Amino acid sequence: VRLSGYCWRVIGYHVVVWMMAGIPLLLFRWKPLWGVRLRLRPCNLAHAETLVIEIRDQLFTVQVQTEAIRVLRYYLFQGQRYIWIETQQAFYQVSLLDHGRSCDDVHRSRHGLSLQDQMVRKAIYGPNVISIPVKSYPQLLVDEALNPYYGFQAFSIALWLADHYYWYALCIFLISSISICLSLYKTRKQSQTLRDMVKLSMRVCVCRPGGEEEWVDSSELVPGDCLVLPQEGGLMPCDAALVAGECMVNESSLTGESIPVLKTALPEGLGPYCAETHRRHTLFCGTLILQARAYVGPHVLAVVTRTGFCTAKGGLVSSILHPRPINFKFYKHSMKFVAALSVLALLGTIYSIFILYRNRVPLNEIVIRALDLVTVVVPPALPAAMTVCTLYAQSRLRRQGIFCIHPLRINLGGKLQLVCFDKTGTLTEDGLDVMGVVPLKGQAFLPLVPEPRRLPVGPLLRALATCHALSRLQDTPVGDPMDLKMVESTGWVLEADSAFGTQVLAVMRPPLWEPQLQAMEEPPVPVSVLHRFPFSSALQRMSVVVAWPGATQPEAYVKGSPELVAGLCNPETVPTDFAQMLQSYTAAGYRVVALASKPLPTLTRDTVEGDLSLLGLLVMRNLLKPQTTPVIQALRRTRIRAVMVTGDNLQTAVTVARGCGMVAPQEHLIIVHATHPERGQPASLEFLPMESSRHLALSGPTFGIIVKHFPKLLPKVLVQGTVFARMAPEQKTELVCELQKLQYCVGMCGDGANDCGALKAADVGISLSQAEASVVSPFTSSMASIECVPMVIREGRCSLDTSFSVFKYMALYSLTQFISVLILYTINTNLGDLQFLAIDLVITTTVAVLMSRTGPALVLGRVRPPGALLSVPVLSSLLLQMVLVTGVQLGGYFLTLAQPWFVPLNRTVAAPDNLPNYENTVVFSLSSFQYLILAAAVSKGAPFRRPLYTNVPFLVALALLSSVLVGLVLVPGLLQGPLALRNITDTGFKLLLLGLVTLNFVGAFMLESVLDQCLPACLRRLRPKRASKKRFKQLERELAEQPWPP
């Protein structure tokens, strides 16, 4: 995180690099800083340094722009704007100028921002736009085509053009152009799918200190400027603190869930505007405002707080544009693999140079042949194969209805070994059923009431009717499902005239019915709502203040989790057997929410939910979705660990885990309960063995106590723990972080608004109730069920196998072609000119692009894909396949030598001037069929991929190439002219060649099958490793020798 500043000699450095002609590799290597400094006009003075290099320990360089009003030196890094302060000499982030600003200051910013201050803050903070520039086509060409690989391909094109191999040069050019086009299309789509999301362009009203009215574009906003919000509704131009009125918004673009959320005006007072503690008082960029009410004045006034990239949406966009490096390695071993391949290539080109020197050839031709061989070693289709494989996988996922912002994470799904779920919404149905309400008398519960409609007028009925954040939107109430079903159960239909405190936020009317019963005593009267305190998952609570045409004083009603609410209630109002009866309902799997009240003596949220008194419990059913038990059973069958992380009660979570199969029968479960220290001793960490493998379940506060007071025992709990309950979102992301610390590949599926942090922290985050692509999590599904989890895993495995099948095959292709030409070099032939074109484009490129189209296996398995190219089976398969191919080619050559008809090539004339000569044709035919054979063999089916005959384009390609090659052998000759073949004029020997290559086909398949069948057993019997690289496996073993809980 160190920034170093540096100010005719640069042209000298450029000329030196050009003369060297490969200085870019040195500057793209361990010593890039030295070259940069030598070619940057070094000058440490930051005030004068126009260039700055930042190191984050990784190495980035950026200019220093200067904007004038007088002078302002700023620079952009990672999308964030930093500016230079003359009074400090250092660089400070734009977001940190107005840090610690007090809420009273935000309120005093109610008045306008003058045009002078507007332009000053415009120059400082820049325009209010999340800038994702559109790249001109030549910019993309210079960005992508400029790299060592394509430069080497251009060199190969030049070299093969030098020796009159026009066709081969042209086809290499075509392959490179196709690869560049595919990379460009991938990058363009990647930029466009993000740019289309941040498209905010609309006029907004803002009031000046004088005139108090002006319409400006969304980009013309700056921090500290007020904003008149549109009461009809619409998108939010930028991040602003709500200063006046109330707002109903739909912030699904950065939260996942699409339920309405209530934002109340910022509470006036002294203290910093955190923007995270006041999250309920802030409107975020790119969020739809369902409505905005004033209740105190003409307009709903907000104050712009942060604009541009520093907004939360801007931060997520910045993360997407510059993602963090992947923690889990995918290969991290290809250096040794390509080193071994290069070793083989060098041992081959040594033979090439030696045998060429053996015969009479000019030294220039000798070096030309050597460089030709080296160019043939490198295949030009590798980047195209990678890109098309990734595009195919992403298209498959999109066709299944799952969208990934950046497909680079797809392969992570192929090596997930732990998946977290949240109970409500994802595992269970979103909706709820109100089973009933349990009331109190003064300190003793009463029988459950099925329909709350039949309650008498009193605190409980009023609390059920009034305590929520429901709002009518187009003749339909909307809000939390819990609140909607509760109010439906009561029947009190949602409907100025301030009673005591302020203007009423809402009014409720009791349903007219029972002329005798309802008016039997105190007929119901409508109830007005004065103050509302929205619900937040961090504090399991919601407080409302209400009055009615009676109401000698107002009344505050609090709805919350039973444990926390009972803690807040008056101790003598809570019955002694609260815990057991709550278990009696939660152990049955019911969601239970407590209602309490206090009569206010005629307002910050703290003084409301204080000396409360229990009114009752609300028991409501919540059933598992019908496609969660099979998914959990499949995941557990494949030894993929499944964990529940939820903010609900521990008893309900345990019951749901038992029902959905996370805790199958005959699997003992313990409850871990750590008591907070009471100033006499630490937590005891009590264990309660439950009654119908080892499983542990613990709530949020005990999890925090274990984290902060038993660090030694934390790994064992995390390894054995499966059901975590009553966790705040912060605790959820903390648990994900801890699981990752144990070297787990942690994926997660979540509903919204309490999983966003955990979803982002997770290696593979999935959001369910999302219409389309979102910046909420790396992956997002359209359908709402857990079934998306296995497919993302399966495709990932299908990718990991598929990628390997490319690196294998194109390596085989890289080297099976390498040996063939060497054989010809030993006989002084050079494999023809159009023959190279036939080998590459007709046969190889089409197969390489088509082989990755195959889909996933449609079922999971316990066998994980490999994680290294240089494993024993892979290298063994490569070597044995090379032995088979070399044997076939040499046998063909030796048999062709041993025929009645034969005339050796005229060795005194260099190729291609001696073609077809009866040796080039046979080697070429064998090589072509060998490429097809290798392609067919490398492309496996089970357990990860479908059988080869699934993707009908690839199978059709294989069939057509085989047919045209067979024709090329079994005809008097139709392409033998252009391909320079000698037209073997007998119908007997060519049939023998066909039989021999059939034997080669059979040999390759039997070889690969025998390897797959036998080598794993040999490795199990031979080298008994006892893997301990990952800490969680070590902990699993240690628990296996002896469990920690007795």
Ligand SMILES: CCCCCCCC(=O)OC[C@H](COP(=O)(O)O[C@@H]1[C@H](O)[C@H](OP(=O)(O)O)[C@H](O)[C@H](OP(=O)(O)O)[C@H]1O)OC(=O)CCCCCCC
């Ligand atoms: C000249 C040889 C040069 C090559 C040197 C590199 C050899 C080489 O990478 O293989 C390492 C593996 C060890 O095994 P390795 O591949 O390192 O296996 C590791 C474990 O499997 C680990 O946990 P568990 O799943 O619990 O086992 C996890 O899977 C890691 O990810 P990964 O599996 O996805 O890659 C692996 O790194 O196999 C040897 O133990 C051969 C050692 C050399 C044999 C020498 C014979 C002469």
Ligand SMILES: CC(C)CCC[C@@H](C)[C@H]1CC[C@H]2[C@@H]3CC=C4C[C@@H](OC(=O)CCC(=O)O)CC[C@]4(C)[C@H]3CC[C@]12C
């Ligand atoms: C034994 C002899 C006669 C053969 C040597 C072959 C050279 C002519 C090859 C070897 C490496 C090649 C270079 C490999 C990499 C590049 C990088 C490329 O520039 C970049 O894309 C770098 C961008 C970056 O990473 O910042 C331009 C072509 C060039 C210089 C290549 C030009 C041709 C080079 C010097």
Ligand SMILES: CC(C)CCC[C@@H](C)[C@H]1CC[C@H]2[C@@H]3CC=C4C[C@@H](OC(=O)CCC(=O)O)CC[C@]4(C)[C@H]3CC[C@]12C
């Ligand atoms: C050392 C002499 C005696 C050998 C003569 C042949 C060399 C000119 C060959 C040997 C190794 C070859 C290199 C082998 C591998 C690569 C990797 C290849 O991939 C990349 O480095 C780019 C990857 C990316 O940009 O993502 C670029 C060409 C290059 C440097 C090759 C350029 C030509 C080299 C230097």
Ligand SMILES: CC(C)CCC[C@@H](C)[C@H]1CC[C@H]2[C@@H]3CC=C4C[C@@H](OC(=O)CCC(=O)O)CC[C@]4(C)[C@H]3CC[C@]12C
């Ligand atoms: C006989 C010689 C001239 C061989 C020429 C090779 C072609 C047959 C290859 C070159 C590029 C290939 C295409 C490259 C990319 C795709 C995208 C792929 O679809 C996607 O992954 C993107 C979907 C979307 O975003 O719409 C389907 C295969 C296809 C059409 C490939 C089909 C085969 C093509 C045309």
Ligand SMILES: CC(C)CCC[C@@H](C)[C@H]1CC[C@H]2[C@@H]3CC=C4C[C@@H](OC(=O)CCC(=O)O)CC[C@]4(C)[C@H]3CC[C@]12C
């Ligand atoms: C110069 C003459 C001798 C060339 C004659 C063409 C043949 C070499 C044929 C045999 C196999 C054919 C390929 C077989 C299958 C396809 C599938 C199809 O490509 C796709 O994969 C489309 C994907 C989709 O949209 O679903 C159309 C072109 C292509 C690559 C064909 C291109 C032409 C090939 C290479």
Ligand SMILES: CCCCCCCCCCCCO[C@@H]1O[C@H](CO)[C@@H](O[C@H]2O[C@H](CO)[C@@H](O)[C@H](O)[C@H]2O)[C@H](O)[C@H]1O
């Ligand atoms: C004397 C014989 C000398 C030859 C010795 C053998 C050398 C073999 C070198 C093989 C190079 C492998 O190269 C590996 O694949 C391709 C090459 O473009 C690169 O691929 C990279 O660029 C492409 C786009 O161009 C991206 O889509 C891909 O995501 C990215 O990783 C890999 O980053 C590189 O690591």
Ligand SMILES: Nc1ncnc2c1ncn2[C@@H]1O[C@H](COP(=O)(O)OP(=O)(O)NP(=O)(O)O)[C@@H](O)[C@H]1O
């Ligand atoms: N709308 C609400 N008003 C008041 N209390 C609520 C509301 N919704 C949930 N709660 C309570 O808050 C507790 C935890 O809140 P949250 O963690 O937001 O709910 P959850 O549905 O248990 N979460 P999860 O299971 O991870 O989706 C729940 O157990 C309820 O007791």
Ligand SMILES: *[C@@H]1O[C@H](CO)[C@@H](O)[C@H](O)[C@H]1NC(C)=O
């Ligand atoms: C092969 O070409 C060379 C050209 O020099 C010459 O020997 C002769 O014309 C041809 N045939 C034989 C057998 O050499």
Ligand SMILES: CCCCCCCCCCCCO
């Ligand atoms: C002889 C060359 C054969 C091609 C080998 C390709 C292997 C690349 C593996 C690493 C890819 C990610 O960097």
Ligand SMILES: CCCCCCCCCCCCO
């Ligand atoms: C890759 C294999 C390289 C070795 C090729 C040797 C060819 C010898 C053929 C000439 C001897 C038969 O008359």
Ligand SMILES: CCCCCCCCCCCCO
């Ligand atoms: C395997 C096919 C190799 C490419 C063949 C290119 C020749 C096409 C036929 C041209 C006919 C006119 O000469």
Ligand SMILES: CCCCCCCCCCCCO
């Ligand atoms: C893509 C290749 C198609 C055009 C190839 C033309 C070949 C010309 C060779 C002429 C000599 C043999 O008649």
Ligand SMILES: CCCCCCCCCCCC
């Ligand atoms: C990139 C090099 C392209 C060369 C074009 C070749 C066209 C065929 C002509 C072959 C006989 C001169």
Ligand SMILES: CCCCCCCCCCCC
């Ligand atoms: C739905 C399967 C699509 C198959 C694509 C067409 C394959 C035949 C193409 C033949 C071209 C020569």
Ligand SMILES: CCCCCCCCCC
């Ligand atoms: C990571 C950039 C790799 C550049 C190619 C290095 C080739 C070195 C040959 C000695």
Ligand SMILES: CCCCCCCCCC
């Ligand atoms: C499932 C393995 C498929 C084997 C058949 C390969 C294609 C044969 C083309 C004649």
